[PDB]
Amino acid sequence: LGWMNALYFTRGLKLTGTYSIMLQKILFKDLFRFLLVYLLFMIGYASALVSLLNPCRDSSTFSKFLLDLFKLTIGMGDLEMINSAKYPAVFIILLVTYIILTFVLLLNMLIALMGETVGQVSKE
Amino acid sequence: TNQPDIVHYLTENAHKKADIRRQDSRGNTVLHALVAIADNTRENTKFVTKVYDLLVIKCVKLYPDSSLEAIFNNDSMSPLMMAAKLGKIGIFQHIIRLEIKDEEARHLSRKFRDWAYGPVYSSLYDLSMLDTCGEEVSVLEILVYNSKVENRHEMLAVEPINELLRDKWQKFGAVSFYISVVSYLIAMIIFTLIAYYRPMDGTPPYPYRTTMDYMRLAGEIVTLLTGVVFFITNIKDLFMVNSLFIDGSFQLLYFIYSVLVIITAVLYLVGIESYLAVMVFALVLGWMNALYFTRGLKLTGTYSIMLQKILFKDLFRFLLVYLLFMIGYASALVSLLNPCRDSSTFSKFLLDLFKLTIGMGDLEMINSAKYPAVFIILLVTYIILTFVLLLNMLIALMGETVGQVSKESKQIWKLQWATTILDIERSFPVCMRKAFRSGEMVTVGKRRWCFRVDEVNWSHW
Amino acid sequence: TNQPDIVHYLTENAHKKADIRRQDSRGNTVLHALVAIADNTRENTKFVTKVYDLLVIKCVKLYPDSSLEAIFNNDSMSPLMMAAKLGKIGIFQHIIRLEIKDEEARHLSRKFRDWAYGPVYSSLYDLSMLDTCGEEVSVLEILV
Numbered sequence: 001l002g003w004m005n006a007l008y009f010t011r012g013l014k015l016t017g018t019y020s021i022m023l024q025k026i027l028f029k030d031l032f033r034f035l036l037v038y039l040l041f042m043i044g045y046a047s048a049l050v051s052l053l054n055p056c057r058d059s060s061t062f063s064k065f066l067l068d069l070f071k072l073t074i075g076m077g078d079l080e081m082i083n084s085a086k087y088p089a090v091f092i093i094l095l096v097t098y099i100i101l102t103f104v105l106l107l108n109m110l111i112a113l114m115g116e117t118v119g120q121v122s123k124e
Numbered sequence: 125t126n127q128p129d130i131v132h133y134l135t136e137n138a139h140k141k142a143d144i145r146r147q148d149s150r151g152n153t154v155l156h157a158l159v160a161i162a163d164n165t166r167e168n169t170k171f172v173t174k175v176y177d178l179l180v181i182k183c184v185k186l187y188p189d190s191s192l193e194a195i196f197n198n199d200s201m202s203p204l205m206m207a208a209k210l211g212k213i214g215i216f217q218h219i220i221r222l223e224i225k226d227e228e229a230r231h232l233s234r235k236f237r238d239w240a241y242g243p244v245y246s247s248l249y250d251l252s253m254l255d256t257c258g259e260e261v262s263v264l265e266i267l268v269y270n271s272k273v274e275n276r277h278e279m280l281a282v283e284p285i286n287e288l289l290r291d292k293w294q295k296f297g298a299v300s301f302y303i304s305v306v307s308y309l310i311a312m313i314i315f316t317l318i319a320y321y322r323p324m325d326g327t328p329p330y331p332y333r334t335t336m337d338y339m340r341l342a343g344e345i346v347t348l349l350t351g352v353v354f355f356i357t358n359i360k361d362l363f364m365v366n367s368l369f370i371d372g373s374f375q376l377l378y379f380i381y382s383v384l385v386i387i388t389a390v391l392y393l394v395g396i397e398s399y400l401a402v403m404v405f406a407l408v409l410g411w412m413n414a415l416y417f418t419r420g421l422k423l424t425g426t427y428s429i430m431l432q433k434i435l436f437k438d439l440f441r442f443l444l445v446y447l448l449f450m451i452g453y454a455s456a457l458v459s460l461l462n463p464c465r466d467s468s469t470f471s472k473f474l475l476d477l478f479k480l481t482i483g484m485g486d487l488e489m490i491n492s493a494k495y496p497a498v499f500i501i502l503l504v505t506y507i508i509l510t511f512v513l514l515l516n517m518l519i520a521l522m523g524e525t526v527g528q529v530s531k532e533s534k535q536i537w538k539l540q541w542a543t544t545i546l547d548i549e550r551s552f553p554v555c556m557r558k559a560f561r562s563g564e565m566v567t568v569g570k571r572r573w574c575f576r577v578d579e580v581n582w583s584h585w
Numbered sequence: 586t587n588q589p590d591i592v593h594y595l596t597e598n599a600h601k602k603a604d605i606r607r608q609d610s611r612g613n614t615v616l617h618a619l620v621a622i623a624d625n626t627r628e629n630t631k632f633v634t635k636v637y638d639l640l641v642i643k644c645v646k647l648y649p650d651s652s653l654e655a656i657f658n659n660d661s662m663s664p665l666m667m668a669a670k671l672g673k674i675g676i677f678q679h680i681i682r683l684e685i686k687d688e689e690a691r692h693l694s695r696k697f698r699d700w701a702y703g704p705v706y707s708s709l710y711d712l713s714m715l716d717t718c719g720e721e722v723s724v725l726e727i728l729v
Contacts, residue, residue: 041412048404054324075483084486087398092478093387094405097380099482100443101409107435108373111521115428118525119533242586243622582587582628 019121026112034105042069073098126171128178135182144183144192151198154179159203162212164275169214176218184229191232200260204253208266211273217282220249231569238566238576245579249284250572251563258554264288268543277535280542287577289542291562292549297421300548301369305417311350312410318343319404328392328399344389351385354378362440365433367422368544372432374416376439381406381413425537427529434520442513450477481506587632589639596643605644605653612659615640620664623673630675637679645690652693661721665714669727681710 046066053061061081068079072095084091134142147153152160158172183192193202201209207216222234236248256262264285267276280286318340323330332341358379365372384406391399454474461469469489476487480503492499549557563575595603608614613621619633644653654663662670668677683695697709717723 037412037415041408044408044412045405048408051320052324052400052404084484087401088475089396090391090398090401092475092482092484094402095482096478097384100439101377101380104373104376104435104439107517110518111428111431111435114521114525115426115431118427119530580624582624582626 019117022121022124023113023116026116027109030109030112034109037105042066042073045069126175128175131175131178135186144179144186145190145195147195147197151196153192153195153203155192155203156197156201156206159206159210159212159215162207162210162215164213172215173218176215177224180232181224181226181229184226184232188228193232202253204263205261205266208263208271208279211271211275211279213275213279216279220282220284236566236568236574243580243582245581245584247577247579248566248568248574249577250574251284251288252572252574254284254288255562257557257561264542265546268539268546277539280538284575284577288562288575289545291575292560293541293545295560295562296545296548296552300551301421304369308414308417311347312414314343315347315407315410318347319407322400324400326397328395328397348385348389351382354382355386358440362437365429365436366540366544367429367432368541369421370416371419371422372429372436374413376432376436377409377413379436379440381409384409423541425533427525427533429537430529430533431521431524434524435517438517438520442517445513450474450481453477587636589636592636592639596647605640605647606651606656608656608658612657614653614656614664616653616664617658617662617667620667620671620673620676623668623671623676625674633676634679637676638685641693642685642687642690645687645693649689654693663714665724666722666727669724 043066046062046069049065050057050062064080068082071077071079072082082091135144144154155176158176162168162172180192183190193204196202197206204216204219207219220234222232223236224230224233234250238246238248240246253263255264267280267285271279273279280289321340330337332338358375365375384402388399388403388406391402451474454470454477457473458465458470472488476490479485479487480490490499561573563573565571566574566576568574596605605615616637619637623629623633641653644651654665657663658667665677665680668680681695683693684697685691685694695711699707699709701707714724716725
């Protein structure tokens, strides 16, 4: 990436202001918020499921909960503990609502951009 | 008729005079007809202000005991109270800016001049009807709760009300917001005590005779009912986004919190012990829903505020058009089963139907290898049905952010800022109402609860 | 008070004159109060530029040794330095465009005229406080 990050050096120098400059501050602002609201949710839900384990459980299980939890968001489907065949009617409705949680946070990016490029962007 | 010459003749007469105080069958006096014929044009706002000054001074000179503004209607409405109903601006801005230079009729003037130390003028407006403390109904209440005129955005932009709304916002804004943060934290700590204290045997529900288990039984009364009230009222509000405190993205996320609670309440009453996954799931969102509390308070209106009402409007329509389609197509396929079929098949149709939209591919009845040429063309058209409903979101946003958003986003934001602060005002009792009441007593003439307004002027000397 | 007539009476007087260089408890002179009352309206940007020209020429004619702009505050702020703090434009654009046609008070004028070869004029602005090389703080630094 670092040698390919040098491809932004070839522009030169910019003095004429565009409208996309103020847009990329909010792009950098909320995507970093989007990553932290992701990772604190994945850690928090994995730490939640260890609290369900009342019998002994093992401290090495938390590494197995967080490993299987990351793969569901990508879609690898190569899991170790969570069997979707065990509880089918609950695994779907948590996964459907997980799509709805993520799809609105993507639309919060676009509305924050569309609600910005109309009134005050012509002056600011 | 814009004719004061008959008004000179009717009031003074050697034969018989004309009573100014006389009402009609509608209980309206001479001033209320001037409000009814008032229009917001250039010419009609001119002479009505001339007649309104002419009649009241003549009413005081003939009758010093009473004022013509004091007489109400059959609906108990003053001429200032009536102008908010019909939404008339020119007669409204003249009654508020009422400074009569006739010293016999001084005691009913509305605008005053306290002191002038050169460049600084100290005007003074009365709050006699603007903030009714212990009276029936106010001017400002009918500006918000009753007036359906389009001109209410301009009518709130008059001089004292732009500063009167900033009075009670600086006293009831941060106080009412901080209670809303704490009262959400109370509902969270109750739900934490429910989740971590379950006995978790595998067979729900549970015996409730134990007093230390009767305590957490009360927690299901508090937590579930709060999700029920937020679920039903928003559907009623849909058929019939207060981003001042918390932005409108929270109302959708707290709705998803409200959906997962009532689903959880079903699952341990059916008898399936897998309720524990969803119950702790919403616990993770609820503490992470507190991250919208860190913004503080918003007063400058953006353009994305009106956008998030339609975002909340159609995504809830997008979920209902999803779920009624999935149930309807599953209930359709049971009707194909003419031989015996079993009532437990409908649970298997709906289970395999949900997995195709996600893409799990772990099915039980529907074999795509059986009918390949039909399963594809139903699935291809299912993509086309869903892809256009996604584009109906974006066109409803792109078709909104062009023409009227430059005005309307600085109208409803001013309107909702006035709407919510009066709903906070109705929440307090009559005892605490007199505590933080704005305005002061300034003894003028031969004492009233008026409001102090500062000015800066360099031209008038 | 937009009244130079008392200003004619206070400065010249057979009984006792009025010191223009006198500060206050905030260390502000007569010019700093004009910056504080300055507003960006049409009327208020007019007469403050008339008084600002009137006082400095009267300060040079009574006292040729020092300028009234040289006296700083408790925060070491000139009237040009103060107008950037409160964000006042009309008093700012007049101190920068300062060309005094009184030849006794010429040596503190800000705008100059170098040469005029017909259509081309050669103006000249001083960088005495705009780019402080080895001084405490600049105009442009407080602007940012």
